[PDB]
Amino acid sequence: GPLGSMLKDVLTSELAAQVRDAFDDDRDAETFLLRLERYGEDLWESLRAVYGDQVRALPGRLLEVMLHAYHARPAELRRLDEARLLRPDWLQRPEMVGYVAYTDRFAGTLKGVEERLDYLEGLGVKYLHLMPLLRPREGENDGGYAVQDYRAVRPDLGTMDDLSALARALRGRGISLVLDLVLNHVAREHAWAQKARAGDPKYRAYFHLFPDRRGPDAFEATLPEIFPDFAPGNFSWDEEIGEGEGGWVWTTFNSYQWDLNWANPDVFLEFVDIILYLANRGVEVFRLDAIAFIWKRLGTDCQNQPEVHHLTRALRAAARIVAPAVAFKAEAIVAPADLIHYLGTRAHHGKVSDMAYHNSLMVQLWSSLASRNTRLFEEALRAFPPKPTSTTWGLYVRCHDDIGWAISDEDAARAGLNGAAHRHFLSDFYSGQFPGSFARGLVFQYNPVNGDRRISGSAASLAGLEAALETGDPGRIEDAVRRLLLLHTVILGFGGVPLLYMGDELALLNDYAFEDVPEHAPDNRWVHRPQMDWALAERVRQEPSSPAGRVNTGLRHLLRVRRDTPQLHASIESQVLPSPDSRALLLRRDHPLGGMVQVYNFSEETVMLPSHVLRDVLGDHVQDRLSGSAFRLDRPTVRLEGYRALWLTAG
């Protein structure tokens, strides 16, 4: 009413005054103001949803961080902002291709990366995610995900100026720098944690600390265990907490990763500052690491609480008011209907993130490779609500983490399967325990209480290459190469940015030497985090007929077709076309210039696919974009040899 309305007016006009006061150039003030008008309601409503009236003291402080970041943003990045505003579908173009690497494993240092841009450009890479490169704790640091200082690059990789210089060289090649924002937890050695331990109450309030077991036990009742072999439960005892004996601290992950307290707005301010600081060094996309974890609530699993989307929307709005070029990419392992909320809901609230990982496609790819059955794949995809058309999936075959079998019991039941049975089969199959399996993976985090297993292993080791090369059998080798090209064809065709994992283009196998590095030996995920093999990269260039060279050549050809297929624009989602044969997966993509059906054989067997299912969509005469060749669809069958993929359009 009038009283409420009057207060709101005084606030709006106070925000306006602080912005106008802050610029001598009026165009700057007016621009800032136009962005605050576009994003302000998202920003502030999101903040009051999480923090209530505490927020009323917040705009002042938040606007200070943003105004200064805006003044500090290099003219070349303000030009980038304008360029992105002019091309809002930039992430959705078929020419978008991602590459993911640890700086040192790929090229030694940030300057080393500059020396391999011709390599990335020759793969048509336009999006480079460098794994956590901010200064971590010494020793074991969860492969960089235990950050000790967000304002420094790990010294062996270089300095913040090399990072900035790298981002400039990348922009010269049309490549966007993408980094992790490790926002759920810091290293126990981070200054915030050191001061919490020394007794500073401001910094004790940045964490979830407990004088004894009463709180910890109460939470543990409803929490899963992420790393039972590294750090049991979700709380760790630290002697140096408090003045007396120590205390308990929330540690979802390793004991040396302390979960931050996002119920404190100071933590929100710190991360606004970190994001804007890194954006001003040329960072274009932030991967929100462990985003589902940031809000704790007694009685729940402390994942995917509503506050997570409020905070994510507010962090995004604050960032883009200053730097419209920056986009966000949620990493979240949750049911499909929930994942869509990490993107946005096309309703009364703003977009939450620009991209999210499609974990379900990755799991179904490996699941159907093992079962040679696509019915589960169809039902898992069918469970997804549509995404907002302006948001984009990140698709992947492998990445730095183990594989969790996120298969829903409901999806499984619709495909005639028992979910628990099938998840159990997938870890037996991918650990190589199932007879005849082609896979050479490793069990990760076996949980004796409930039987849960995940799997580590490189794409080429999981897809049969390592086993096939031991035997020498030419048929086992050919099938493994075909499986690797099939997996990559799906992620390149599905709609979204395909995130190639460093070295998969050379079919790198498990690196069992991780056992010889004491800091890596307890964590078999290092098995699929190899050093780049440049000697191999040069052999495949000069001799492409080896198994690695046929993966390489095949993948480069698929990348070229992807770039030239307008049906792959990510604003359009792939839909299941129900297959008459359980060895094949059919995906339909409508598009202004004519529909596409992608056809995938998930079996080594020759499939005679009944033609009518395809003819009904595309008519009598089609072309395959992948091989150039033709099919008449008025014939009874289309012959798919083992692992054949087709990208069919009319013609």
Added chain:
Amino acid sequence: GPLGSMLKDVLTSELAAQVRDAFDDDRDAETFLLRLERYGEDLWESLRAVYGDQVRALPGRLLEVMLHAYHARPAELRRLDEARLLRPDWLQRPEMVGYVAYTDRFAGTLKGVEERLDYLEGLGVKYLHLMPLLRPREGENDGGYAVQDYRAVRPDLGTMDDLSALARALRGRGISLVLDLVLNHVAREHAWAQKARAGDPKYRAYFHLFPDRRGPDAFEATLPEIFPDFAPGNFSWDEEIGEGEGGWVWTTFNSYQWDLNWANPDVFLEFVDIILYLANRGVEVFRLDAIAFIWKRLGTDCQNQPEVHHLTRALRAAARIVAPAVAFKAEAIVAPADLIHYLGTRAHHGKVSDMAYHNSLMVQLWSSLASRNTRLFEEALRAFPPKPTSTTWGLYVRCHDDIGWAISDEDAARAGLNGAAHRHFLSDFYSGQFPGSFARGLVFQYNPVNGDRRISGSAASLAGLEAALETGDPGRIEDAVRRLLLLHTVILGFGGVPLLYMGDELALLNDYAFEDVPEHAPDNRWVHRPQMDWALAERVRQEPSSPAGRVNTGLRHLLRVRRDTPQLHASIESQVLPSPDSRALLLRRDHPLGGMVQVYNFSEETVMLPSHVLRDVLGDHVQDRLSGSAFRLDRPTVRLEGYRALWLTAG
């Protein structure tokens, strides 16, 4: 190769130099340059597609017009540009509602319009299309579409400064000014035509002139006749053409509308200038009048030639480099697969237009109202390829023009109908010749050679109100009111901006007094171009139970529900859900928060719709957004009384 590449480089760097030379403020130069980089390839490739190497002499001249327009653009409109870049889906929001009116018929003059903003705002109007208000020829002028001067407002409406002042008052209420760009033809009295007649060869080249019948006869072989009762054929004889006896001039429409020659780049430059001039007076959306006509080619119907899309893309790119706020809305009566090319193709080329009229929805609405059968409606919609998700339909029940029955023979055959039979039925039905018809329309442009008829008449006269009020029968009145609310429910729910026609919210009937105005009497379209009835508008406000007040109240309620239904975002298209009963039309809309099924009874009869078709999409429990009420879908049937509409979501 090297020679081709070198020339291209010299051109790019010459364009860059002209831009940098033109700005003292470097930010301005850099902005202009960033826009030229975003749009330049569209612009120039489109130009060389239409004009070949002539184009090479063009950038200079074109950049001059654009640079100056950019310098001349008011800071308040540059702020508008930024605001639109920040909200690229602005036209697709459910809160978007259009209103279409002749300035003088609505409110007398442009300043008069300022005095009715509370009326437009109280209807939730955010998009105002004022009918052609540029100075026309005196006398008969095709309701403003024979323009004599594009740089002057018709003097009785006001001046260009009143237009600018109006656009500012509109922006204060969140309303976008929308005007016609009459780019296919000018009045015979326009200075270009006067000088062509006086013998200036520069301006003779702005038209399609012929010394005798040889050219005209050759074209006529493949041209339809648009206005056989006004101006036979497509050519007119003018005594003052040439020095001798006169000559022939291409006149697709009335004899006093001279088709412009778009094979001449001077005509392209003139229209770039007109567009940028009007954008700088606050025009936000340009309706491209008769866009399908602008390219002539011997041997064809001279409609929808490829050059039309090239020119439209180039005009758009030139405009938005200067004024990113401006959008384009194609008016084109063409087969569905073709219409999609007036929007864009989501391929290697830029977007052609932001909006297009969905003429097919309008025709099917009236067609199914007459037949009480929706099967043709289903097949007509099913014929559409998808549009680019960033483009938006303009939907309408009526407008200033007659209705053409654009029903395809293929669509009709799929619904078991003969296309020609059904089109013939619709003009018999809507002219009131078919026994029992409720419609009071007028035959327009009967063509004795081929039998073609169109129909004039106001929505309320076509939908049964005029006939029902003559009889006094309460049942005929109720059905007519229900039909009018049904038509508007569909356009409000379909996805896109609903373009309310001035006065339909008061259910205005045919104005038969057009016969008493000598300039209007030959053209019965004036029958559905009434003066606004403000006394009626005030009666419905105070007495909403009259038939006009129940249309008014019902429509205002539908507008409020539309604004609050996030499923209506125009990035998502309505799909046919095949109906088990031919009296009902079912439209499905997927959305992140859950699907919607809209259910429409196109019959006066009570339909017991089998529940399974809806339950399969939405589950057991639904709510109707239109009435608030509920349905259990596990019951055998859902009762739809005559003309019932439902907007169902789960719950």
